[PDB]
Amino acid sequence: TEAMKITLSTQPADARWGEKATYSINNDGITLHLNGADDLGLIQRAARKIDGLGIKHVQLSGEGWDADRCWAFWQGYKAPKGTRKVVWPDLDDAQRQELDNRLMIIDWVRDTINAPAEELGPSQLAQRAVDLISNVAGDRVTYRITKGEDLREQGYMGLHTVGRGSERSPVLLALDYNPTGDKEAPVYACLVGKGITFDSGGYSIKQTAFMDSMKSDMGGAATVTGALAFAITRGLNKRVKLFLCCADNLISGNAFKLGDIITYRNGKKVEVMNTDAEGRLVLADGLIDASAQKPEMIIDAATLTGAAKTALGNDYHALFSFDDALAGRLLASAAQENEPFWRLPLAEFHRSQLPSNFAELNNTGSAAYPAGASTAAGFLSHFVENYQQGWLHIDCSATYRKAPVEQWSAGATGLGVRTIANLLTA
Amino acid sequence: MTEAMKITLSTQPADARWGEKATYSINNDGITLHLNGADDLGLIQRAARKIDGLGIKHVQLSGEGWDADRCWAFWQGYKAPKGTRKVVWPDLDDAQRQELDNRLMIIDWVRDTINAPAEELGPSQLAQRAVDLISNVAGDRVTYRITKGEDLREQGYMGLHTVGRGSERSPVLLALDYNPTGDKEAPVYACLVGKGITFDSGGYSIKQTAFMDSMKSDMGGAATVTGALAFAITRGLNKRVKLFLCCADNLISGNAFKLGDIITYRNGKKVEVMNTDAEGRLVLADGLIDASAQKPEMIIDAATLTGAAKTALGNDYHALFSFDDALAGRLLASAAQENEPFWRLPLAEFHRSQLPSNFAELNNTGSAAYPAGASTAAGFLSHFVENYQQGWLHIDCSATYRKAPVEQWSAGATGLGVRTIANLLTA
Amino acid sequence: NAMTEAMKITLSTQPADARWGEKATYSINNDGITLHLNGADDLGLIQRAARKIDGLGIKHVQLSGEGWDADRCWAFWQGYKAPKGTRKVVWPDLDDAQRQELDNRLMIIDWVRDTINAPAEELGPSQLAQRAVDLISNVAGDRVTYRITKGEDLREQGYMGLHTVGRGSERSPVLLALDYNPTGDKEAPVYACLVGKGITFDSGGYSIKQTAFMDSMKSDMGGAATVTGALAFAITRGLNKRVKLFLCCADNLISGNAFKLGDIITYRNGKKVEVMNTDAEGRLVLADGLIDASAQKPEMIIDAATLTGAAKTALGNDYHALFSFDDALAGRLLASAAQENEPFWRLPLAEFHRSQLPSNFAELNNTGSAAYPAGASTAAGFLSHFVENYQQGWLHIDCSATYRKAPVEQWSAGATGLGVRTIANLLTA
Amino acid sequence: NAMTEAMKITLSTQPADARWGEKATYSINNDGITLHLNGADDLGLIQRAARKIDGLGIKHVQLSGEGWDADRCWAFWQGYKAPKGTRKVVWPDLDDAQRQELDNRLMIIDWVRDTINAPAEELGPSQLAQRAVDLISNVAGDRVTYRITKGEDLREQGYMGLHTVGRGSERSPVLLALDYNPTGDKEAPVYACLVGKGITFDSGGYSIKQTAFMDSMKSDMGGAATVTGALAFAITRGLNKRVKLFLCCADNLISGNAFKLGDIITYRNGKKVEVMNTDAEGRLVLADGLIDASAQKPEMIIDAATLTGAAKTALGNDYHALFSFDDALAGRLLASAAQENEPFWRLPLAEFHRSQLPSNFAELNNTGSAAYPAGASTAAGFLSHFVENYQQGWLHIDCSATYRKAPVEQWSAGATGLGVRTIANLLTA
Ligand SMILES: [Cl-]
Ligand SMILES: [Cl-]
Ligand SMILES: [Cl-]
Ligand SMILES: [Cl-]
Ligand SMILES: [Cl-]
Ligand SMILES: [Cl-]
Ligand SMILES: [Cl-]
Ligand SMILES: [Cl-]
Ligand SMILES: [Cl-]
Ligand SMILES: [Cl-]
Ligand SMILES: [Cl-]
Ligand SMILES: [Cl-]
Ligand SMILES: [Cl-]
Ligand SMILES: [Cl-]
Ligand SMILES: [Mn+2]
Ligand SMILES: [Mn+2]
Ligand SMILES: [Mn+2]
Ligand SMILES: [Mn+2]
Ligand SMILES: [Zn+2]
Ligand SMILES: [Zn+2]
Ligand SMILES: [Zn+2]
Ligand SMILES: [Zn+2]
């Protein structure tokens, strides 16, 4: 397990590799050939190949290494199985401090989402979320976990109806980060995350090829939890509340059925016409709680629809909002944090593109309204009192890679944590 | 309180702008229905549906020409599961209004109970709502017995128990007894048997979402025979009739019945389960055994049993099965008097052996060689009626539910069948 | 092959001994095989016994002893006959009438079975039309005339239904217009018009079928073969009235010329049909035969077609589906089915089935919806748009009892021939 | 069942009486129908009302009273018009400028709707190319010239993309190269090149579609009709610059000559493409048009195509997908879309998309992988390999809002005509 040196050079590789070669190898170690086009993308792609060569011990040596370039290499080098060692170079304290916070919190998002569903049930997601934030938030953090029958008694009909099929009761984490300590302090932001720890699809059962990665259906919850923790390391000094709607969507003699009508505390009635469209049902409860706090902005994140992945692939997160100003601020943050986001449509006509013959709303679209991600966003707007301003919905199409690509190993990428954190501390 | 939209009747056509073919037209006074005498009940129902699609939520049935049937025809079409509708009835006479109010109360109870989501209507809720509807019109002339959960297993109701033990909501057998004379030894005139699957996922033979999304209505047979008995009583039924509802959920759990399982009934029949989604005939079997023990004059079972009957008759007719030509003819004669659609489909001695199993006397499913799903299901049920050749009617309720709205029906339950069975019991 | 020897088959109202079973349909002793009638359904029992005797490898039988009449012999042969192996049957002593009746069924009803069982390669539209002429003109003689319209001529003369369906095949579509006219008088009133679907092979078109459903689609010309045999058998029964036959013959295949979804066919009666499923081609070719049948203004029109799977889902392979608006005429066909021991069952047809095929681009669609799933009723409702006087003197037969994809208790694999006798009885009644 | 007499449609800012409600978009008294405008979106409301008025079965309307204009009349008609039935609309007393704009829309946009709604049998490659010349020649007179290359000539001259997809059909593939040159000068610089996918019927080839997804594939030539209608409308709006039109027209059918999976197509620009899905044929034909477009060295290239279902999954039928590397040009089209009241949404197109179609046997694959499931973005990435300067002056429109398989609030079934005004507006500005 001896270290392999990785150097940076602006000169191309020798003709034995080609002029376009991104990396070359000799006794002095591996050399990454930067060309100024996209050095972070090139380094991350090179790291993916170095892992593929069976090299488990590297050292970033020579000049040119900064936090962003070190992070790029790690993002691509990290893989779910195996042990990897990276000897970092001489960085100033601010550069190393930024890298350490990224390593601690963003890899926590990668590892939590990658974790098996047996290891990470609703209850484990709640307490691991408290631990991550409590470790950086000092004494300025209070929380409450409501599970099982208590969700029924308190009217959380969305989260309870979806989770009750499981032997692992559904959980609501309500975490409060309040820096001033003043219990009257105004709530600046409300983060809401979909924490479905495993999605069988319900009685609308999935096919194996589409269920084999549904341990990552809690990726929205892990991304907003990381965003809060990472924001705190960035100097967040405003009150933020975190709502994680956690549950298993399983099949039992108790699971919810098609045609069942869910009555939310805001009066909205929803006919369930597909148990696999469960993500929007649990988020609706988090959003009602989020609107009640009357925050300056509400941000909900969720691995909600496959329609977002058909529109943007795994290369961008989908951004939905009625607020043009707030959408531009998040895209500006996305650009500073070098994370991919693309705005997909959300207009008033999407709020009526979920017809039902037995209730005000349907949890699915139809053949006539097949914009799955746009209609889902339209459904969530019925649960945000002032939906036309201060609300962002993120369909996390870039959260999980079912197979290794050029720059990513398999599993969670951790994308979206820096963008949301940057918007919170802006 | 707002302004109601007047609905009047005319035997003359609309003006040259609406055209001679127009079934309705709107002037200053309100909406005018243009009758032609071919099928006024059908035309008025189709017109009411279009008046609902216009967004008009408050109507007044105005002027001459209205009676119980024309008012009922309008309501049947106007009513829909969503929204709130006010209908101001015309100045009907006592008898006409009594008959209209009996249909509103009982037949709309059949539409709402079947339209109800499975979460709000389980096996125990169905049995209880059935007792409530009948005692509301019967009073002290009705008594009943519930038998649920482990009690069914102990007492040998293996059909109903095996299908419903998968649900956390225990299966329920309701045995209601309408006895006017009170005499406990009075002869039982009719035995009604109804399939009450409050939700059908198909069991381990799981359905796809597109065919499961309306399975809250798989207890439609139970609701129809219940409404039929209630309606019969409002029509002056004065004979002893027993009602049997086999109510359960067909769900998936670690306790749910599996393919290959052999169910032994109380009459000796052994049935191999080769499709858990063919559960409706498994639960009726227990209902038909109890119905036969009463040795009644007639037995009428109703069930949303197969998609085959819907391929044969669509949602336009109910499927009638029987070995008794005289009795079948009387139900068709009742359907004609009550303006309800019924069509007879084949049931012969050879259907009784078109469910071959390698491991038991009977199979619960058919094969490629015998694809008449509705006829093979009726043939299976004949094995649980002692005198199957006489006094037994089976109804595959293909006209009970409408997955989508059509010309004369909103989405959901129609309530068809209640008047026909009620008329047959009172004839 | 070694010389096969006859196995004597006798009849007995005495049950078999205990070694076999309480109620066994047949027993085998030294002198040969004994069938054990019980008086319940002797014809059904004999046909089922015959099927089993085939499964014993016995290729040569001799019906000996008293008790054998025309029906019991025919009943036996119906079950003994199979599309593989050669079978010799020594008939018993019958009177001239009984033997002539048996010989007519053997010649015509087996022709229906063999022609339907024939591979598509051997029986194209032209072969079906010619073999139908050969059969009828072999019993009618000089009393039969016919015309054959095929290929480009169908398009030129407005037969857009049959041409559009068939132009995908290298084998041109064919329309047979045969005329059985006894008194010779060309002005004689046409008593009946038989119309038949003769799809010699149904790939389903661009709406391509699954192999499990196409592997028997050589039999999609059963209706054509059933009405042809019905006329031939009716003539041997002494049919002395004028009857015209129309066979709409074509292959439904896939080519760079095959018809497409969204195409609108304009028929001669002015009705426009949108094709929203190329596999619902049966009703497209019948519509052209039904126009010609109506034009002749006969006393009754009978049409046969292996049209829908909906009829097989409703009646199985055990009954032919009967569709009509005429209660009196449907009653007579069921009355005929009883005298000929053939299974028919009436399925619904009402004025509302005529509007259960909506289209966004044309008056009629060739397929039903999710809201109107009675495939056999909507198909009959589609055909009613091509019979000028559809409420009187018209019967549609969805031939669900024509073909058996697999052997059963009383039938081998392949065509059954059922329907030939019932139509014949109604024509000669 | 004759044509009825005119029913009057008046506009009003006063709401409906309580019987209808106060949120009712329309009411009906003895005088006729009244539309209740509120000012939120009167064009949307009027169009949705027209759709409901057609649903009542009213075939003859007369827009009367004050308040009507070209946009409000056009809104009413956009919703009233349907492919089925006969409708008549008496227009109100507009001024010449308003009536000239309405007449230009009725002529050119309803042509785009009627041409796309037409059955594949009526509109093959040659018919599409010819109707396209007829429409533009009607408004352009002698300022229009054109060139048609078809059948074996496309193979000879190296249009391997368009020829390989269309050769499976009996109807030969056709490339229309139309030139609108107002100044006459033959050396005039080409301002714009329009390219249109003109697949007159998409069976999907050997990668055959199911009936449910093919029943509307007569509309797979929507791109061609849209850019064609756009050039015609642009001329009525005073277009005074040279614009070339390229329509890659073909049938994607099955035959013994149809193209096969694994087949490598060599384009005139040297690019090799491995076909791994014959249903991704739209991009193979556009590639040939885009090479001709680039060769003209134009200021801008606009291509339109009903290319992928991924755009319909991403935007529904409510917006057209816009792809481009040119932010400024993309910004100019959305500005035109706003002025013309038409829905467009931009989807991602970046350098990494040019390598998201991997093949093991050729530089490019014509299909995407599970790893790159953004079908519309990878399709745009593929087309970019056929535009010389793909980073400047090129727009790709995935026409996800061109066809409605079923009636909705504001549209009947069939083609909408959306995209004609936007492209026309961009060309004229
Ligand atoms: Cl190189
Ligand atoms: Cl690692
Ligand atoms: Cl969802
Ligand atoms: Cl990996
Ligand atoms: Cl009446
Ligand atoms: Cl069943
Ligand atoms: Cl409804
Ligand atoms: Cl043989
Ligand atoms: Cl057909
Ligand atoms: Cl065989
Ligand atoms: Cl209102
Ligand atoms: Cl029109
Ligand atoms: Cl394509
Ligand atoms: Cl339409
Ligand atoms: Mn799901
Ligand atoms: Mn079932
Ligand atoms: Mn077919
Ligand atoms: Mn295609
Ligand atoms: Zn989910
Ligand atoms: Zn059931
Ligand atoms: Zn066919
Ligand atoms: Zn295409």
From Swiss-Prot, chain A:
CDD domains linked: Peptidase_M17
Active site (catalytic residues): 206, 280
Catalysis: reaction(s): Release of an N-terminal amino acid, Xaa, from a peptide or arylamide. Xaa is preferably Glu or Asp but may be other amino acids, including Leu, Met, His, Cys and Gln
Protein's organism: Escherichia coli (strain K12)
The protein's name in its UniProt record: Peptidase B
The encoding gene: pepB
Oligomer status and interactors: Homohexamer.
Enzyme nomenclature, EC number: 3.4.11.23
HAMAP family membership: Aminopeptidase_M17 (MF_00504)
Cofactor: Mn(2+)
Family, similarity comment: Belongs to the peptidase M17 family.
Function text: Probably plays an important role in intracellular peptide degradation.
Single GO MF descriptor: peptidase activity
Matches recorded under SUPFAM superfamilies: Zn-dependent exopeptidases (SSF53187)
Keyword flag Protein biosynthesis: no
Gene Ontology biological-process annotations: peptide catabolic process; proteolysis
Subcellular location: Cytoplasm
Swiss-Prot record, chains C, D:
Catalytic residues, chain numbering: 209, 283
Record's cofactor remark: Binds 2 manganese ions per subunit.
Spans through the membrane: none
EC number, UniProt record: 3.4.11.23
Amino-acid positions noted as binding Mn(2+) 2 in the UniProt annotation, renumbered to this chain: 197, 202, 220, 281
Subcellular location, principal: cytoplasm
Entry keyword set: Aminopeptidase, Cytoplasm, Hydrolase, Manganese, Metal-binding, Protease
CC annotations in GO: cytoplasm; cytosol
Cofactor: Mn(2+)
InterPro entries in the cross-refs: Leucine_aapep/pepB (IPR011356), M17_PepB-like_N (IPR047620), Pept_M17_PepB (IPR008330), Peptidase_M17_C (IPR000819)
One BP term from GO: proteolysis
Gene ablation phenotype (knockout): A quadruple peptidase disruption (pepA, pepB, pepD and pepN) does not grow in M9 minimal medium, grows better when supplemented with casamino acids.
Gene3D superfamilies associated with the record: Zn peptidases
Reaction(s) catalysed (UniProt annotation): Release of an N-terminal amino acid, Xaa, from a peptide or arylamide. Xaa is preferably Glu or Asp but may be other amino acids, including Leu, Met, His, Cys and Gln
Pfam families from the UniProt entry: DUF3663, Peptidase_M17
Record's subcellular location: Cytoplasm
Subunit text: Homohexamer.
Main function: Probably plays an important role in intracellular peptide degradation.
Record family assignment: Belongs to the peptidase M17 family.
Listed name of the protein: Peptidase B
Native species: Escherichia coli (strain K12)
